[PDB]
Amino acid sequence: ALWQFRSLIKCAIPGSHPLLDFNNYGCYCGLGGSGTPVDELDRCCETHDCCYRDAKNLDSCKFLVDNPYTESYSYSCSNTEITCNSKNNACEAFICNCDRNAAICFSKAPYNKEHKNLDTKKYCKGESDKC
Ligand SMILES: [Ca+2]
């Protein structure tokens, strides 16, 4: 679920404010996405977008979960380490992992303030054929 993704990000990145820091960043961090990712961090979001695209096509997710942000999963956080609990079913596990990988990627990528609140209509034209 969305509140869990925010929580995973805070686990991986102590002191972060997910909605302020990552939502609406670059071409892919936020609802939707297009163009070529402007940087490593943006590529993390493109990858997460793709992961959610894949999740929607998973058998265990197909009709039960149309929007992964409404699907809660089981996880734990310890010393900035994220764990997707085994109790998760196929659909819940896939989503948790998408979020977990995204959170880690975010924590290891440089943060470019000038890529925040990007004018996507001017800098995100076209479509990246990735993932
Ligand atoms: Ca996106």
Swiss-Prot record:
Keyword Signal recorded: yes
Disulfide partners: C11-C77, C27-C124, C29-C45, C44-C105, C51-C98, C61-C91, C84-C96
Cofactor note: Binds 1 Ca(2+) ion per subunit.
Subunit-level organization: Monomer or homodimer.
Enzyme Commission code: 3.1.1.4
Catalyzed reaction equations: a 1,2-diacyl-sn-glycero-3-phosphocholine + H2O = a 1-acyl-sn-glycero-3-phosphocholine + a fatty acid + H(+); 1,2-ditetradecanoyl-sn-glycero-3-phosphocholine + H2O = 2-tetradecanoyl-sn-glycero-3-phosphocholine + tetradecanoate + H(+); 1,2-dihexadecanoyl-sn-glycero-3-phosphocholine + H2O = 1-hexadecanoyl-sn-glycero-3-phosphocholine + hexadecanoate + H(+); 1-hexadecanoyl-2-(9Z-octadecenoyl)-sn-glycero-3-phosphocholine + H2O = 1-hexadecanoyl-sn-glycero-3-phosphocholine + (9Z)-octadecenoate + H(+)
Known function: Secretory calcium-dependent phospholipase A2 that primarily targets dietary phospholipids in the intestinal tract. Hydrolyzes the ester bond of the fatty acyl group attached at sn-2 position of phospholipids (phospholipase A2 activity) with preference for phosphatidylethanolamines and phosphatidylglycerols over phosphatidylcholines. May play a role in the biosynthesis of N-acyl ethanolamines that regulate energy metabolism and inflammation in the intestinal tract.
Binding locations of Ca(2+): Y28, G30, G32, D49
Active site, UniProt feature: H48, D99
Interval of the full protein contained in this chain: 23 to 146 of 146
Gene Ontology BP, a term: positive regulation of cell population proliferation
Other observations noted: Loss of activity upon alkylation of His-48 with p-bromo phenacyl bromide; Ca(2+) and Ba(2+) protect against inactivation.
Major localization listed first in the record, in broad terms: secreted
Processing and modification events after translation: Acylation causes dimerization. Activated by trypsin cleavage in the duodenum. Can also be activated by thrombin or autocatalytically.
Lineage, highest ranks first: Eukaryota, Metazoa, Chordata, Craniata, Vertebrata
Protein family (similarity comment): Belongs to the phospholipase A2 family.
Coiled coil: none
The name this protein goes by in its record: Phospholipase A2, major isoenzyme
Source domain of life: Eukaryota
GO MF term list: bile acid binding; calcium ion binding; calcium-dependent phospholipase A2 activity; phospholipase A2 activity; phospholipid binding; signaling receptor binding
Regulation of this protein's activity per its record: Regulated by bile acid salts. Up-regulated by cholate and down-regulated by taurochenodeoxycholate.
Lipid positions (N6-palmitoyl lysine): K56
Species name: Sus scrofa (Pig)
